[PDB]
Design a protein around this ligand. Structure first.
Ligand SMILES: CCCCCCCCCCCCCCCCCC(=O)OC[C@H](COP(=O)(O)OCCN)OC(=O)CCCCCCCCCCCCCCCCC
Ligand SMILES: CCCCCCCCCCCCCCCCCC(=O)OC[C@H](COP(=O)(O)OCCN)OC(=O)CCCCCCCCCCCCCCCCC
Ligand SMILES: CCCCCCCCCCCCCCCCCC(=O)OC[C@H](COP(=O)(O)OCCN)OC(=O)CCCCCCCCCCCCCCCCC
Ligand SMILES: CCCCCCCCCCCCCCCCCCCC
Ligand SMILES: CCCCCCCCCCCCCC
Lengths: 478, 55, 100, 162, 110
């Protein structure tokens, strides 16, 4: 299919982020200016976020065989852009202490955001593969941005090797699926079968290898072991981006693939994903019980929260509000992770060497940084699914979706993992208030971002109806 | 005989089970990249075998 | 008169050989070499599938695959050079300080 | 046409087997180059002419040139890890070999149950690939330019000398 | 068609005879001529990161070159739309090249 002017209007955040990449790179070629290039990057990301309004006015349409733009794509584009803007905001005071080149960071963040937007709009195996790669490779650079530090270099090496392995797994699975199906469009994956022959062995094997790649990308058990090391070793704004934008974009494209593919309602794939979700919830909660590192603990937490999201994924064809539950949960998880990782980033700013990630460094945070401690305890309550937080609204959505589809093993897993999470999240939040032995407007902007995240988490925990109505508006093509 | 509250300890049993299971699961995070690759391939084998069994 | 199963089997054999080389080699260069083998095998599988259906999409996916392979090889070899600069040793077991 | 396919596939398999077990890195890269040439021959036997041309031009002419370049720069000689031959010890490779054999058996069993009319080997030209690339796959082309730009920026940031 | 199979046979014989010809000259060079020994006959008569940078730039720009190779053989049937797409591709290429030149990535001289 060709590209029309209305298709170009539906292309608007992708085009704006690409133009921002080109403009920022040419500005770096002109002169290395940290403030100017950071400002140009955040201006481009804000312009894409604003142009989402024109995208919504355009309507839902297919842009080439590769992409389909609807309310679903708009919501995930907005989430990716919000995470990228927060990542740049946290990146500037951290990069102020960086002695080497700082301007390439925003270029890499912009290209990764471009990959996130592509994954939001992806309707095709080609676009899914390209969006995953377009997220991953800038993250190879960003995780090892402070490559003189041994932890950042080790995290970069681990992430690069394992993501290349997962990409080869995903591409081999895509090739097997294409060999069975003869079409790489999402709606055709299983369409050429009938009379109860959906469980074609090559199609299932291809989807299993794609599950290997995607479950690496979503930190799902047993493709999860990279998560605490890469989360700890990466720079703290990079950890923010990797926790929010990459996970949200990859889960959104997984949502769309399982909604559109006729093989998505196969019972074998459903049982395999149920096993993966159960193991992810239980394992991610259990491994975070005895973590003295806040970044590793947040990595195991991310494993458990993606397990809850996968539980919502399993009831996609059974129930009616699986996509709405996923949208509400992902908005709440984005805000909670933005606040927690942003407090970590502000505590590690400016960059001086090793990250401030020990729990002893956050012991007694209230006595010198009271606002940051209040934000961090709000986020620990939100990630525990405590009421008057948006995390509880997401957990309630997950539980309702599981109860409707009679996924009782998954519901019990969510309850048990919630209790374990209660233990370690409360441990962090109350260690904030114990007793233990900046000065520029960009650091204040980062503090304002984490404060706004805390206020949004509390307000939408008490009053979740605006977020619920927004997510219900953002519906894909049936 | 009861002064130690035996029912409280019997209900504390799942906490020690969770502690033991978490300590056992943390052994997989040994920090070795080659083991992480091997665990990815083990999970690939398990997922593929499960899909072929329940096909 | 080439069965599609034979091309897919050849691609799978190359893929598992590359995965074996990725697992069993401590040297980071041989890990990257195994990664190149696996992504080349997946690209070959896409070419075989495209040739079976008489479509250009297999070769287009091959093109995207080798673009990924080139950029990933570039990044991995840069990281290998950094590891050799800061360690004078390419043993991947030495980069293990983050655990637990 | 199938003679070339089976012989090139056998050569690629054997060369890859020599790659993953070899000690000398330049020799291993040479066997990898041989396997890529054989894979290009496989591509030409299937009618994917552009894929085979790019297999030698880009894979066996640029990427492995970069690998060879890095190896020659590092001056890899009598390395301690190289001298040990740890991967040749049965207790090291017997586990991963069984794991890969199990994965291969499962994938082959899935492959053998698919519908197969055979590949006719009708040549799909580079012209049709170029038409498809700049037609339905335009966004793939532009975002692949962005992907390779990201690889360029990352590799310059990491692989600098300073 | 017998013309294409005749050309395939001719191409195969060309490659075989060329490889065998260089092999035969190497064999004749090894076999012929006497050999002598000397004491110092066996005696033979760290590179910067710029080498890797140049090779890496070559790899990346060769992949973008393959994209333009595919475009250039089908320009007429891709129309002006394909021209606009390839112009965007080439502009991103030239912006990357300008960025590489301006930051000193392609400056061997200090
Ligand atoms: C310093 C500079 C700062 C600049 C400002 C930065 C912050 C503010 C950013 C504002 C972004 C605005 C985006 C607006 C998107 C919706 C636009 C719109 O008009 O949507 C309406 C449309 C359905 O209505 P209608 O127009 O009738 O549809 C015809 C098409 N068939 O609706 C749709 O089709 C779908 C509507 C929902 C799509 C998702 C919403 C956008 C992304 C939100 C991400 C965050 C969500 C979670 C937080 C919510 C908090 C309340
Ligand atoms: C001799 C016994 C073995 C000795 C040791 C190994 C030597 C090398 C063996 C591999 C290379 C030669 C294979 C045989 C090719 C013979 C030509 C042939 O098969 O032509 C048929 C076909 C012609 O094309 P088409 O128009 O489709 O015709 C079909 C019939 N009308 O052809 C095609 O469609 C494709 C033609 C082949 C592809 C191009 C050549 C690839 C060469 C790859 C070499 C890899 C490295 C080898 C290293 C060897 C030492 C380790
Ligand atoms: C119509 C397109 C015309 C060509 C545009 C791209 C040319 C790229 C060639 C190149 O590498 O140029 C590098 C050059 C560096 O110039 P510089 O080092 O600042 O020189 C100072 C004293 N002469 O930089 C230049 O010459 C700048 C060229 C324009 C840069 C902006 C547009 C890029 C697209
Ligand atoms: C110094 C640390 C080195 C770690 C090397 C790790 C190697 C892992 C090898 C795994 C072998 C698995 C063998 C098959 C297991 C059974 C089948 C798969 C699971 C059902
Ligand atoms: C660790 C979590 C344990 C949860 C146990 C849930 C058991 C559900 C059993 C459902 C049986 C349904 C019979 C028709």
């Amino acid at each position: 299919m060709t590209i029309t002017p209305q298709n170009l209007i539906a292309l608007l955040p992708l085009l704006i982020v690409g133009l921002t990449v080109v403009v920022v790179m040419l500005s770096i070629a002109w002169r290395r200016n940290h403030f100017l290039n950071a400002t140009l990057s955040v201006i481009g990301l804000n312009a894409a976020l604003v142009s989402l309004w024109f995208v919504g006015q355009a309507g839902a349409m297919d842009v080439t065989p590769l992409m389909r733009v609807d309310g679903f794509a708009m919501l995930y584009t907005g989430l990716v852009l919000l995470a990228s803007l927060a990542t740049c905001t946290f990146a500037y005071p951290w990069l102020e202490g960086y002695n080497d080149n700082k301007d390439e960071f925003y270029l890499l963040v912009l290209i990764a955001a471009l990959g996130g937007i592509l994954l939001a709009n992806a309707n095709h195996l080609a676009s899914l593969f390209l969006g995953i790669e377009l997220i991953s490779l800038p993250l190879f650079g960003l995780v090892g941005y402070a490559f003189r530090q041994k932890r950042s270099l080790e995290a970069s090496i681990k992430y690069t090797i394992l993501s290349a392995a997962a990409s080869s797994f995903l591409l081999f699975g895509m090739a097997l699926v294409y060999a069975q199906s003869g079409d790489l469009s999402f709606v055709a994956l299983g369409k050429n079968l009938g009379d109860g022959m959906l469980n074609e062995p090559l199609l299932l094997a291809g989807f299993g290898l794609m599950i290997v790649g995607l479950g690496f990308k979503l930190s799902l058990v047993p493709f999860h072991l990279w998560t605490p090391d890469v989360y700890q070793g990466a720079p703290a704004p990079v950890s923010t981006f990797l926790a929010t934008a990459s996970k949200i974009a990859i889960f959104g494209v997984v949502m769309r693939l399982f909604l559109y593919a006729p093989v998505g309602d196969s019972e074998a794939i459903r049982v395999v994903l149920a096993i993966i979700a159960f193991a992810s919830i239980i394992f991610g909660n259990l491994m975070a019980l005895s973590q003295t590192n806040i970044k590793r603990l947040l990595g195991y937490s991310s494993i458990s929260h993606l397990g809850y999201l996968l539980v919502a994924l399993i009831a996609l064809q059974t129930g009616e509000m699986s996509m709405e539950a996923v949208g509400v949960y992902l908005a709440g998880y984005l805000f909670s992770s933005l606040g927690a990782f942003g407090v970590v980033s502000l505590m590690s700013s400016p960059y001086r060497g090793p990250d401030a990630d020990s729990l002893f460094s956050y012991r007694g945070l209230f006595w010198h940084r009271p606002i940051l401690a209040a934000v961090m305890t709000v986020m620990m309550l939100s990630l525990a699914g405590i009421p008057m937080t948006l995390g509880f609204i997401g957990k309630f959505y997950v539980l309702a979706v599981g109860v409707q589809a009679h996924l009782w093993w998954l519901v019990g897993a969510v309850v048990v993992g919630s209790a374990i999470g209660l233990y370690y999240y409360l441990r962090v939040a109350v260690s904030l208030y114990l007793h233990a032995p900046p000065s520029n407007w960009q650091y204040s902007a980062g503090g304002i971002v984490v404060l706004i995240s805390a206020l949004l988490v509390l307000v939408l925990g008490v009053w979740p109806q605006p977020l619920i109505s927004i997510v219900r508006l953002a519906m894909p093509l049936m | 005989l009861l002064k130690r509250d035996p029912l409280n300890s019997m209900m504390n049993i799942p906490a020690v089970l969770s502690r033991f299971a978490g300590k056992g699961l943390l052994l997989s995070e040994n920090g070795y990249l080659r083991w992480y690759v091997a665990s990815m391939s083990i999970g690939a084998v398990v997922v593929l075998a499960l899909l072929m069994v329940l096909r | 008169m080439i069965p599609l199963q034979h091309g897919l089997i050849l691609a799978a054999i190359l893929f598992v050989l590359g995965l074996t080389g990725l697992v069993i080699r401590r040297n980071l260069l041989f890990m990257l070499i195994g990664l190149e083998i696996m992504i080349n095998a997946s690209a070959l599988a896409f070419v075989v599938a495209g040739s079976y259906w008489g479509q250009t999409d297999g070769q287009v996916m091959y093109i995207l695959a080798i673009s990924l392979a080139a950029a990933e090889a570039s990044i991995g070899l840069a990281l290998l050079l950094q590891l050799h600069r800061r360690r004078q040793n390419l043993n991947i077991d030495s980069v293990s300080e983050m655990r637990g | 046409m199938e003679f070339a396919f089976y012989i090139c596939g056998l050569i690629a398999i054997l060369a890859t087997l020599r790659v993953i077990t070899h000690t000398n890195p330049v020799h291993a890269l040479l066997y990898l180059i041989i396997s890529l040439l054989a894979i290009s021959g496989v591509f030409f036997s299937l009618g994917a002419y552009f894929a085979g041309a790019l297999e030698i031009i880009v894979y066996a002419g640029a990427i492995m040139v970069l690998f060879v370049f890095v190896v020659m720069m590092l001056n890899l000689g009598g390395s301690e890890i190289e001298q040990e031959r740890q991967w040749l010890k049965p207790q090291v490779w017997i586990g991963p070999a069984i794991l890969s054999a199990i994965m291969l058996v499962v994938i082959v069993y899935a492959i053998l149950g698919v519908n197969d009319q055979g590949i006719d080997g009708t040549p799909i030209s580079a012209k049709a690939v170029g038409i498809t690339l700049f037609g339905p796959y335009v966004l793939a082309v532009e975002l692949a330019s962005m992907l390779l730009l990201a690889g360029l920026v990352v590799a310059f940031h990491v692989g600098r000398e300073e | 068609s017998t013309e294409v199979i005749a050309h395939h046979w001719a191409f195969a014989i060309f490659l075989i005879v060329a490889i065998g010809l260089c092999c035969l000259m190497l064999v004749g060079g090894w076999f012929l001529g006497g050999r002598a020994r000397a004491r110092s006959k066996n005696v033979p008569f760290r590179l910067s990161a710029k080498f890797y940078l140049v090779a890496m730039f070559f790899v990346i720009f060769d992949v973008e070159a393959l994209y333009l190779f595919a475009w250039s053989t089908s320009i007429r049937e891709s129309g002006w739309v394909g021209f606009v797409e390839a112009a965007i591709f080439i502009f991103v290429l030239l912006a990357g090249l300008v960025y590489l030149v301006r930051i000193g990535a392609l400056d061997w001289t200090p």
